[model samples]
Target: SWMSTVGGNSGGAPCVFPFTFLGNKYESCTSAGRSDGKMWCATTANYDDDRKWGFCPDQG
Candidate 1:
C-alpha cells in the first residue's frame, strides 16, 4: 500500500503536491471542483496547466 495522503484511486494517478484548482493552490487533496464532496488532486504540478487529476480514495 502507498501513503494515502499521496495515493491515487483506481485511476492509477498519484497525487501531485502543491497543485492548483480554480486559481488556488493546495498541498494536499481537496474537493474544490466536485459537488459530490469527494477529495481530489492534480496528477501533475498544476491543474490549470496540465488539466489532469484523480480522485482521492477514502483510505486517506
Candidate 2:
C-alpha cells in the first residue's frame, strides 16, 4: 500500500497522506486509510492542486 516515490517514500500499509486533499480534483483521495481493511478506498488518485498526478491500481 505504497503511494509515490517522486519526492519521497510516501508509502505504507496504511498509506498515510497529509492535509486530506482540499480541492475538487483531490477530493477523490482516501483521506487517511488503506484498502486492506477500509471501505472501497480510492486505489488510484486524481489530485491536481499545485502539482498534478494520477495513478491506476496495477497499470496505467
Candidate 3:
C-alpha cells in the first residue's frame, strides 16, 4: 500500500505509484534525478502530464 503525507499547512502531498519522469517510470520514491539526493515521488500517476511531485518521507 502507498502512504501520503499530510496536506497544505505542512506543504506535503500524496504519492502516486508507477509515475513517469524524464521518460522513465518509477514504482516508488526516488532521488534519481535530484542533485540533493533527497527522495521524491510523483503526486499524480503521470508526472509527465501533471508535473506534480512530493518529497518522500524519511524512513527513519
Candidate 4:
C-alpha cells in the first residue's frame, strides 16, 4: 500500500494519484510476497513543496 502526508495530516482511500487532502504527498510503498511466489508492489512520491509535488513523479 502507499502512504503520504498532507499538511501534517494523513488520509487515504480507494483512488489514484493527486489524492485528496491539501499538502498531501506519498511517503512510501510496500509489497508482500503472495502464495503464487509473486510480489505485490506500489509506488509513492514525496514532495517538499506543493507546487513541485505534481512534477515530482517525473523527476529523480
- Evaluated with lDDT, which candidate comes out highest? 3
TM-score of every candidate relative to the true structure: 0.72, 0.20, 0.73, 0.17
Steric overlap count per candidate: 0, 0, 0, 0
- In the range 1-60, model 1's lDDT, one tens digit per residue, is 253333333256667788888898888778887787667777777888777877775643
Compose the digit string of candidate 3's lDDT tens values, residues 1-60: 356644212256677788888888989777766787667788878888888777776556
* Model 3, position 42: C-alpha lDDT score: 81
Residue 44 of model 4 has an lDDT of 26
How many angstroms is residue 50 displaced in model 3 relative to the true structure, after the best TM-score fit?
A: 0.7
Where model 1 places Cα greater than 4 Å from the true spot, the runs are 1-10, 58-60
Q: Which ranges in model 3 have alpha carbons more than 4 Å from their true place?
A: 6-10
Model 2 has an lDDT value of 0.30
lDDT of 2 by residue, 1-60 (tens): 454422112332222233233343333334233334332222224223333322323322
Candidate 2 lDDT for residue 23: 45
Ranking by lDDT: 3, 1, 2, 4
Query: Candidate 4: lDDT over CA atoms?
Result: 0.26
- What candidate 2 gets wrong by more than 4 Å, as runs, is 4-22, 25-48
TM-score of 3: 0.73
Alpha-carbon deviation at 36 in model 1, angstroms: 1.0
